[PDB]
């Protein structure tokens, strides 16, 4: 795929949308609407969004994602301010919370087991 970068809430930037070409395979602000609607809350760190183009449609592959799932559950927007030791904000996820994030991920993830899936998310959470 031919990939692209995005900021939360952005539309119609000259540098980012125009030279990279407007998906929909023409007519930006088609996609410019589509990305923007989806994007969620405040901009923060940039995410990938990834472009795939079809006949007169655009689709984006967007994972802020499993970690943005963590943000919703904890009710904490940041990430680990002081890496791997102890976070500055006090975002301790519960054990019950993490298996439900794992349940939902289990389609996107390969994972064999639910217990396997819990490690994979937990490894993401700690760091």
């Amino acid at each position: 795929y031919l990939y692209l970068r995005a900021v939360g809430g952005e539309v119609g930037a000259s540098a980012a949308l125009a030279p990279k070409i407007g998906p929909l395979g023409l007519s930006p602000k088609k996609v410019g609407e589509d990305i923007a609607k989806a994007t969620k809350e405040f901009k923060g760190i940039k995410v990938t969004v990834q472009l795939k183009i079809q006949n007169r449609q655009a689709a984006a592959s967007v994972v802020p994602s499993a970690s943005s799932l963590v943000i919703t559950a904890l009710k904490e927007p940041p990430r680990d301010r002081k890496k791997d030791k102890n976070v500055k904000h006090s975002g301790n996820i519960q054990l019950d919370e993490i298996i439900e994030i794992a349940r939902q991920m289990r389609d996107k993830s390969f994972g064999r087991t639910l217990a396997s899936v819990t490690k994979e998310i937990l490894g993401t959470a700690q760091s």
């Binding site: 002081k82 030791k85 976070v87 500055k88 006090s90």
Partner: protein, 443 residues
């Protein structure tokens, strides 16, 4: 010969109007007695204190209070103005209380914390308790009276950079390089079990609202500033992190709270931020001005002292524009004491000078000179009346606020005084040097 008097109130406080005429012969002590009768405050030990008639940069001194009113009427400073020479202008404000018989044997010293450093707390008034914090990773609660160590709080992983003390004196809070703040019971010397996580980097400063006037829904909280560039508000009773204030690019050196509603922060990113702590976590205003790092803060007015040696005074709460830029110090102002205290600010600087300022006017009331080296700390000891300053020159000096003259100086062969806390009765000084001892002076 008579005088007409015109008194207009200065600061929020008492109000009264009406000119009142008194005879000319009368002294200052008599003038206050006439004025206070009108004010409706009694002629009790309440001093009722005066400031006068705005100006005095001239060749001469301007308008002292204590000069007899007939003498003032002729010649205030000039003969006066066209609008004076007919009235005398008085600004009236309380405080203040007296302490009598000074005494003096050498202070008891309480050795502790080997060769170490940073914080001091003395609960003023009844509290005899003094709390010292150190890089040694511990804190010690001491008896101002006995001068013996009550306990040492040995929770922290590393160096203790800051502390807060409740007036009850029952609760102590500390900030450590270990990145956590802890709440302790000073009597027990027992960790509250309050270990507060969330800060990534060292917790440099904190201000605590010991008691919350507002309904119990709101409780007492402590705000902490960290190297991580963020501030957090914590519930002392239940050690939880109520809110996080993000937005500072650089480390947060100083913070003021107790505002109970306004969080004021000064950071290395040369910015001063005013915040709404409650469920929002949003910074309403960012004060821009300081060329360099903001070291110290006072929150009446908002006052910031910067490395760029300037002090800015910030106007009422919503607008975010600066009232005045106070210049004159050469170097970094370590600490300042500002308050509702007649809008009077005292600043201690590395330049080894101390200045008294009128925040409203912007005028420099006076500068205290005589210390050899940088001024580490200051307090308006007596009150409006006295200023106490500490320095490298091992000196804690007592100065006359009105005169800006130096009355007397405390220490000799030693090294230096890092900081001081003063109560009406006594002074506690944290000192450092090769042979160390905290000093407790009693008067």
């Amino acid at each position: 010969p008579n005088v007409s008097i015109k008194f207009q109130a200065l600061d929020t406080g008492d109000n009264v109007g009406g000119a009142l005429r008194v005879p000319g012969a009368i002294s200052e002590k008599q003038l206050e007695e006439l004025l206070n009768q009108l004010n409706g405050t009694s002629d009790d030990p309440v001093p009722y204190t005066f400031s006068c008639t705005i100006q005095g940069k001239k060749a001469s001194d301007p308008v002292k209070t204590i000069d007899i009113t007939d003498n003032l009427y002729s010649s205030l400073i000039k003969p006066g103005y066209n609008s004076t020479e007919d009235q005398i202008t008085l600004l009236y404000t309380p405080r203040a209380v007296f302490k009598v018989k000074p005494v003096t044997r050498s202070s008891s010293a309480i050795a502790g914390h080997g060769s170490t450093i940073l914080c001091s707390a003395f609960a003023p008034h009844t509290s005899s308790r003094m709390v010292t914090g150190a890089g040694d990773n511990t804190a010690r609660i001491w008896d101002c009276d006995t001068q013996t160590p009550m306990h040492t709080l040995k929770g922290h992983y590393n160096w203790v950079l800051c502390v807060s003390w409740s007036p009850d004196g029952e609760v102590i809070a500390t900030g450590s390089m270990d990145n956590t703040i802890r709440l302790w019971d000073p009597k027990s010397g027992q960790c509250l079990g309050d270990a507060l996580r969330g800060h990534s980097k060292w917790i440099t400063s904190l201000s605590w609202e010991p008691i919350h006037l507002v309904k119990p829904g709101s409780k007492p909280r402590l705000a902490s500033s960290s190297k991580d560039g963020t501030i957090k508000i914590w519930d002392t009773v239940s050690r939880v992190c109520q809110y996080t204030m993000s937005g500072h690019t650089n480390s947060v050196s100083c913070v003021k709270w107790g505002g109970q509603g306004l969080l004021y922060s000064g950071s290395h990113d040369r910015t001063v931020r005013v915040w709404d702590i409650n469920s929002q976590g949003r910074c309403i205003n960012i004060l821009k001005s300081h060329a360099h790092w903001v070291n110290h803060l006072s929150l009446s007015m908002m006052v910031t002292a910067s490395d760029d040696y300037t002090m800015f005074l910030w106007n009422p709460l919503k607008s975010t524009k600066p009232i005045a830029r106070m210049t004159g110090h050469q170097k970094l102002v370590n600490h300042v004491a500002f308050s509702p205290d007649g809008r009077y600010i005292v600043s201690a600087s590395f330049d080894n000078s101390i200045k008294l300022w009128d925040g409203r006017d912007g005028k420099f009331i006076s500068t205290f000179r005589g210390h050899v080296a940088s001024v580490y700390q200051v307090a308006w000891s007596s009150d409006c009346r006295l200023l106490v300053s500490c320095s490298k020159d091992t000196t804690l000096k007592v100065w006359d606020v009105r005169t800006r003259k130096l009355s007397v100086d405390l220490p000799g062969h030693k090294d230096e005084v890092y900081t001081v806390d003063w109560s009406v009765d006594g002074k506690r000084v944290c000192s450092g040097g090769k042979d160390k001892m905290v000093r407790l002076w009693t008067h």
